[PDB]
Amino acid sequence: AESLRRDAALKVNVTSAEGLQSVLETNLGPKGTLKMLVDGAGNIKLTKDGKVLLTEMQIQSPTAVLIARAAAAQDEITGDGTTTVVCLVGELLRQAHRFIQEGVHPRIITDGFEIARKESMKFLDEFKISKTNLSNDREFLLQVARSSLLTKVDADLTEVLTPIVTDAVLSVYDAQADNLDLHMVEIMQMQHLSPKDTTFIKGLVLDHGGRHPDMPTRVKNAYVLILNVSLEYEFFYSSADQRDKLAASERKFVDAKLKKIIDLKNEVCGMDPDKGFVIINQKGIDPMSLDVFAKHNILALRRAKRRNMERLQLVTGGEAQNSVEDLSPQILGFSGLVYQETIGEEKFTYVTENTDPKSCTILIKGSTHYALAQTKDAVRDGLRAVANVLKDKNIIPGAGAFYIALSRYLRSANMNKLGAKGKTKTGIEAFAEALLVIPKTLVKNSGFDPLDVLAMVEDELDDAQDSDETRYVGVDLNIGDSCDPTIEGIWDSYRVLRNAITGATGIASNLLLCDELLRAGR
Amino acid sequence: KAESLRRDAALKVNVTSAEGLQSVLETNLGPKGTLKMLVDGAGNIKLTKDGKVLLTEMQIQSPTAVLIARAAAAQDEITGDGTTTVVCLVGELLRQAHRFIQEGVHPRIITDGFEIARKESMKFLDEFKISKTNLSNDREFLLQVARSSLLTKVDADLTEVLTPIVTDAVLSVYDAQADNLDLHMVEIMQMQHLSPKDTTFIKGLVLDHGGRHPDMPTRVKNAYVLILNVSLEYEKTEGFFYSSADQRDKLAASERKFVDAKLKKIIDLKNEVCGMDPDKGFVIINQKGIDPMSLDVFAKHNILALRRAKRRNMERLQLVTGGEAQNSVEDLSPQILGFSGLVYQETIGEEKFTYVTENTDPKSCTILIKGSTHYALAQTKDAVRDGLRAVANVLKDKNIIPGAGAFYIALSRYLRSANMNKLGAKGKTKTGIEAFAEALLVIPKTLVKNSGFDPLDVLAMVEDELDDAQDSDETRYVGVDLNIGDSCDPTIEGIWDSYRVLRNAITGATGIASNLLLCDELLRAGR
Amino acid sequence: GQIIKSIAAIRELHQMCLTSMGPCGRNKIIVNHLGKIIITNDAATMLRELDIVHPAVKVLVMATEQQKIDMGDGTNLVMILAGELLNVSEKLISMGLSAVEIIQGYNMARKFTLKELDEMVVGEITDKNDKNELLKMIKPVISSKKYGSEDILSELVSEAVSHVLPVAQQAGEIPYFNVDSIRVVKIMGGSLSNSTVIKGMVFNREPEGHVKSLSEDKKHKVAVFTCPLDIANTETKGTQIDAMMKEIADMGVECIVAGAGVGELALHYLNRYGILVLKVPSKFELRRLCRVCGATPLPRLGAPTPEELGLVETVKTMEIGGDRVTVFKQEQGEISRTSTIILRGATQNNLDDIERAIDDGVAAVKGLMKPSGGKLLPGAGATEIELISRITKYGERTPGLLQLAIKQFAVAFEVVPRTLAETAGLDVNEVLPNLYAAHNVTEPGAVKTDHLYKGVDIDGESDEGVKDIREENIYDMLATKKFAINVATEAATTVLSIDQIIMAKK
């Protein structure tokens, strides 16, 4: 067992929090650095994603495990803002340790943290900007991705991934009361091209290429067949003629199947110009039955996971045919440009220009598991982040303007409200001081002076207040002076900040109320 | 042959040291204060709340603390009090700075704000002071001043004892006609065998060596004092042969008759000045000795006779009664004698002491420190040596400052609200405006902490009443009530402070902190 | 400082490559954990054998894998550029320039460098596939591997390359030259002049049949079988041998290859009647026989369908260096898709290492394909020194702290002309300042004439300063440089961004 008292429990908890902050402090903002994760077997990840970092990192101190579990819960709710939580929690505990040593009982502190949480919801509702979802609002949607992707990329994939995510998102959410499902966007990875070769595929990519040297590479305006029955070879001879007949025997059952298929070929786009016929088979296809498909200018694939073709059932929209003896001319779907690209081993089939299946694939390219992990997470984070925009019309002026302007409301208006109490005013001050950790860390990670930038921010905030105008004041991490996120293009999420402030308040309240470290089960 | 920190952790070293001097020298603040024990290793214990004693007589382990202590020692030699407030102000100025240092504020920016605040603090001090009239009817205010300085250094039961003693002492030394006062004319004596509550005020001067003869008069109502430098013991001219017991003294008494002729001439003065006349008396205090038979004759004429006088007290004795030192009894004249009232020699079984009181015109007084133990006599000696300088600061400087931390409390409000609205510094230097005002709370905060009352809540109750003054359009001097737990009015309760002490307290604290905050490397020399 | 500790780690592999690159380079002894002595100048072979310790090295090593797999040259250009790009960053770090500001600078220089490389083009290989145009590139590629042996290896490669580059005309969309198009074999004994090139496949295994030669006809037809040869077994179980060749020869076959085992009588009779018999342990090499002899393997047994026979000009058994080999080759027709490099050499390390060099020369020709691969750059640091001057000009044009990064960026390109000197033994205190002046001139014109051709003298021709690259025809591949700059710039950006190394949950 273990027991620590005389408030040493509070001293230990602060030490753990200040450490976890120092781990993920430099991991914040577009000027931030990358963290390495070492598996010990040689697999290395270089990531800024706190959802990855907090999940995979070895945490030595037991107090820091509490913040990791809580932050991961926030990740599975809003889908972003992990390092926001760790930074907010850490400074809430440091600013409190100062007041704890001054004689403020921990309960007095945590009660004011709850009082301020109620006030933070008031500013959020007034600070939000409602946007339309019109198809000409790509200006705003592009700015959203230029905000969210910029954090997780190297600034050169910013221009690459910006239109890739933007178009992928609009393929899912119709401009109406529809829906949005991130399983409607496929995340594909491959090698042999550079990270900046990541591209948007209008449809679905099949990884398995066929085994035949004449497989047609360019197939335009073709119907698509999915077969679930083997077309391969499905016995005593004394001479060459009988041996051949035994081989033809089981392939003659295939032959009749092929006759009905080449009747399906002659029936469907057999005489139609600029059109053709694509066949995909869950099972095998005979190399001579592939010679037949090549003979009739047919694209063939075989030995494929039905789950990939299950998407093709949605993408091309045909009926899967369990028996070619029951082969019907109407079961086929529609497809446009079909391209089979060749890498060092397998060939990839691009099923594109599809009627209107509302399904898309983002093809992540790169050389090493280093960058493929970086982009894999970047795309999944970006698609989810932009989805929060189309799910919630409310967009928050970014650049810390939420975290900056709260310092004005918490300091000024609440003191005239007197809505708390004289001694709990200590906590109102602690919360306002700690909300500066987000704009402050963003500056520190840029190399600009952490105090002077905040001073320049405050000046514009005062000028707009004396001018009686609406001015959204942010931080320019390139020049060093202040900016306006609504002009520069930095946007943030309503739902993320709601769950960030309410979550961090609870995390810190739970940690500030820690009385005794009791070791149990031992 | 070099050691230094290229990292700024030298600031972490200096701050750590200051936190120690805080935790050591903080708990002594206030009438709710605690007492520190200095053990000298020879077996002597010095029980003190006085900062100068704890600063000058402590074993300092930290090399940084050496500076803070020796610098604070200069506070007492300028104002005569305020050494504890220096130590506390320095520590909090360094602790509030560490907060801003970790934010990346260069020590220059912090230091400049410390200097900017010093300029602003002088404005408040002059506006906050209460000009005192020189009316000798100030006994009420002078008594209240004594309580302010005494209630700190003694146990509050010796305050009722020492309050009229110090007050009436300084009322004697303070010259009229706007002439100054001289604390060197106020005597402080050490006497054992009595209790600490027996400390007493004597209108005049007390002598160590009393009368040693059974016929020495106990007291003289109206005394005429002689300071005599003539050797009245066995002397000879600058052959003695006796053959029996009869012839020994005949020769020596004849050689001492050169004295006895002066013994005759001394009683010729006694007969010249009221030999048998009533309501008159004759006190002899001899620098040299008195023959045992010369004391017998001095008894014959009812003369209070003292012998073997200390020179420095004898020089005072000329000032005590206004008489002259007599180098020859043949020059003994009737007008040389000085007049005094009740002169009596109090019998202490160790030594009888001579009380020479109600003197002609000495303008000088003696405070007899009474107490049996050494730790008690030392504590009281500090209380007298301190309080006499506290009442001197008030009579010298007619300006008195509302106490109970009203200076340190209100200065916080004025520097917090006005400075940035004044535009009196700069946007980045505002970290010093806040640092100083936050550190000004170390004094009212420590006063509360040592009382057991709620540190935050008491500070809040103070601010509430100070807000009422803003709407009331009146001057409300709000201070910390260390008895009830709430606020109080220093001018109603009687808690006072010094203009000069607070002037040099803020000036010095800025200097000590500025020197430490600007420290870069700790270097080793001679190694 | 994690970035400081990373700098210390890269100093180890920097020391490895700093003395490696160049025709005057120094070899490394590499001891394989399985008991093999490997002595080579190839840093890719080095890093494959070098165990990786500091995770920052894993970045640099995987970077060289990107270069080596995707481009058949640039191995040391990645390690050398990367080593110095991170070395010079130590000055920027110590000057107080933050990691993100250093990163921003190198990315800004990435744009400046790529645009200038397009302007450094001197000549262009017009894709004549002529031996002379091949030698212009093959020679400098063989250089840095064996200094002075280019005469032997250039005649070996440029002639072997003409075997796998067939007569092609109007062909920019038809790809040619697979990496497996040229095979290299090792015969212990002989010297460089004992090496030669066979226009087709050579089996390192000694002749397995008793037949030396076929008929004299052109395009001897050939069969490959997949099933094991024995007395005809029925389609099912069974719980004629020589008749196979009676069927095969019907179309004109003089040579019978069996991709499987051989029956009793055929082992005697196939060879008895003067037909070559073959069974190949390498099954991909059977796919090579599909490409060399044109033979289509028969999936069945004893049934050589006419479409399952190929046409091969000449198959004989030959003696190489006294150790016998079997040759399945083409001859002025059905042109072979594979040519074999016959290396005779007595030292197994030099013999194998010569193959390692020729392997890279084969790979270079793969980059001499049509993908904008004809562009030539001036070699011997004429690219590097001219980039130094042009980068410093972009510094003058660039305001802000980016000027400090650009200045240190140019310093990094001095490591290549420096390495060329330190390995060659000319005083770096003399060669380098002479390089600066040779390329930094005031031209009466916007086109530097004879001042973009100034080189680095690795020869024993004693001269103050440096030579002209056109004397030996020393040109560098633009695509190799452009891709290398992209790899090293991003790779160094990666290392410069590592702030903390965290061990995963275990």
Curated annotation (Swiss-Prot), chain A:
The gene is CCT6. Coiled coil: none annotated. It holds the Pfam family Cpn60_TCP1. Belongs to the TCP-1 chaperonin family. It comes from Saccharomyces cerevisiae (strain ATCC 204508 / S288c). One of its GO terms (biological process) is protein folding. Its main location: cytoplasm. Heterooligomeric complex of about 850 to 900 kDa that forms two stacked rings, 12 to 16 nm in diameter. It is found in: Cytoplasm. One of its GO terms (molecular function) is ATP binding. InterPro entries: Chap_CCT_zeta, Chaperone_TCP-1, Chaperonin_TCP-1_CS, Cpn60/GroEL/TCP-1, GroEL-like_apical_dom_sf, GROEL-like_equatorial_sf, TCP-1-like_intermed_sf. This is T-complex protein 1 subunit zeta. SUPFAM superfamilies: GroEL apical domain-like (SSF52029), GroEL equatorial domain-like (SSF48592), GroEL-intermediate domain like (SSF54849).
Swiss-Prot record, chain C:
One of its GO terms (molecular function) is unfolded protein binding. One of its GO terms (biological process) is protein folding. Pfam families: Cpn60_TCP1 (PF00118). PROSITE patterns: TCP1_1, TCP1_2, TCP1_3. One of its GO terms (cellular component) is chaperonin-containing T-complex. InterPro entries: Chap_CCT_theta (IPR012721), Chaperone_TCP-1 (IPR017998), Chaperonin_TCP-1_CS (IPR002194), Cpn60/GroEL/TCP-1 (IPR002423), GroEL-like_apical_dom_sf (IPR027409), GROEL-like_equatorial_sf (IPR027413), TCP-1-like_intermed_sf (IPR027410). The modification Phosphoserine is found at S462. This is T-complex protein 1 subunit theta. It comes from Saccharomyces cerevisiae (strain ATCC 204508 / S288c).
